[PDB]
């Protein structure tokens with residue numbers, strides 16, 4: 001039968017009891033695996049996420065000097081590339097994040113301040129997430145303009161590398177785009193298409209998500225710029241994606257939806273969007289082909305999904 005999905009924004013609280021409990025930091029391969037302090041610090045951030053409930057302010061955390069040093073290294077190194085590689089929407093908002101959210105080399109911004117700023121721009125809000133959510137729950141949150149965000153940071157032994165999302169990736173990669181109204185509507189359309197969709201389509205939407213929100217390129221004037229969070233938080237791939245090496249294809253969902261990708265090396269190919277409004281339209285058309293015995297609409301006044 002139709003798989004369950006949240007109908008009010010508060011029902012998102014039901015996701016905490018549905019994450020992968022044995023996370024990446026438990027693998028022998030993780031940069032912080034033999035470090036017991038790092039291991040305890042991760043447990044500490046996971047307990048904060050676990051106990052969090054919709055509507056509460058996100059807890060503030062005092063980051064250690066070692067964590068701030070890792071943040072500073074990542075921040076200074078990536079910052080040099082945005083003016084020439086990042087899409088206009090990213091560069092337009094960055095100064096405001098520096099002024100009101102504390103985006104600076106010496107300070108890790110607190111999620112509550114960032115979430116309030118996003119709320120004022122487009123109504124997006126953040127909630128801390130323990131570990132790995134299923135694609136279904138992760139995309140479902142977007143229908144409500146809710147982004148599940150990590151609050152921990154990568155291990156300091158390898159500042160320019162992370163095998164998973166961490167706070168540098170969320171703040172430098174995702175957050176700036178969620179400040180833009182058109183990108184916000186586009187992300188939300190992906191989430192709405194996902195509600196009650198059969199598993200095999202959830203995987204298609206997760207693949208579309210990967211080639212847009214995480215690794216998307218966008219047309220701007222007669223140029224091409226990065227807007228994908230995974231590119232914007234990766235020093236090496238951001239430079240590589242705008243060089244002559246990768247193959248570039250126009251965003252076509254029927255095709256993008258089944259494309260294979262790897263998470264371990266630079267992407268051999270990227271899809272280019274004409275604009276976020278156009279990508280939004282393509283998602284809405286694609287959602288029409290998903291076999292669901294109903295239709296959905298979000299009502300921002302009461303924060304509930306209406307099932308038609």
Ligand SMILES: NCCc1ccc(O)c(O)c1
Pocket residue numbers: 133134135138165169214
């Ligand atoms: N679901 C696979 C892991 C994942 C999901 C969403 C993201 O934004 C990200 O950076 C990584």
Ligand SMILES: [Fe+3]
Pocket residue numbers: 165169173174214229230
């Ligand atoms: Fe991400």
